[PDB]
């Protein structure tokens, strides 16, 4: 059903933030989260920005189900976005180009320097794109606790609210 992939965000990209990134007007509901500040807020804004444009997007990404999770790199500085997405217009021949276009088109608006994110899809043993994204969400992504997971966006019923709920994420762990 749902594809899987990762985008890496080096810390150099955060340094190039312009006023459009900082002066974001969108609401980050941290009523059940850790305080989002500095680059964690910048990445939460970016992830919320990409989802916002996606909810009313057209083309192959219209009518798609998505679940994006930005997390801190486990051993280094920087972040990585776990990307789970799937839909009628979305197939293996355009998945990479659609995901890279979507995330980069938003990022261009928010930075001072020329940057590009590279999408790397999860591959099976035979090189075919993985399609176990919903179970990846359930068994792994939703079992992260902030601020290991920094922010999260989704349009899938059930995760629409639980995904940014620290108390619910601790339930999926236990």
Identify the CA nearest to 48 among candidates 150, 170, 133, 117.
150
Residue 163 is classified by DSSP as: T
Q: Which fold has domain 3-173?
A: Replication Protein E1; Chain: A, (3.40.1310)
- Describe the crossing of helices 38-55 and 95-108 by its angle, rounded to 10 degrees: 120
Helix or strand (DSSP H, E) at 149 = strand 149-154
Method in brief: X-ray
Query: How is residue 103 written in tokens?
Result: 């995330």
Please tell me whether 71 is known to bind a ligand: yes
Asked if residues 6 and 80 have their Cβ atoms less than 8 Å apart, the reply is yes
Please tell me whether 174 is known to bind a ligand: no
E strands, 52-105, in order: 65-72, 79-86
Other Cβ atoms closer than 10 A to 92 = 11
Does 129 participate in catalysis according to the annotation? no
Bridge-partner residues for 71, per DSSP? Answer: 80, 149
Active-site option among 79, 129, 140, 159: 140
- Label residue 146 left, alpha or beta by phi (over 0 means left) and psi (-120 to 50 means alpha): beta
Resolution in A: 2.4
């Amino acid at each position: 059903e749902l594809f899987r992939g990762v985008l890496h965000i080096s810390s150099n990209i955060l340094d190039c933030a312009n006023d459009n990134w900082w002066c974001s007007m969108l609401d980050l509901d941290t009523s059940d989260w850790e305080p989002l500040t500095h680059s964690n807020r910048l990445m939460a804004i970016y992830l919320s920005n990409v989802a916002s444009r996606l909810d009313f997007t057209g083309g192959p990404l219209a009518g798609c189900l998505y679940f994006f999770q930005v997390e801190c790199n486990k051993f280094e500085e920087g972040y990585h976005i776990h990307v789970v997405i799937g839909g009628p217009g979305l197939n293996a021949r355009n998945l990479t180009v659609c995901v890279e276009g979507l995330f980069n088109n938003v990022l261009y608006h928010l930075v001072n320097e020329s940057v590009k994110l590279k999408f790397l899809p999860g591959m099976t043993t035979k090189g075919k794109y993985f399609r176990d994204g919903e179970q990846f969400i359930e068994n792994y992504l939703m079992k992260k606790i902030p601020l290991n997971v920094v922010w999260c966006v989704t349009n899938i019923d059930g995760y629409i609210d639980t995904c940014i709920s620290a108390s619910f994420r601790r339930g999926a762990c236990h």
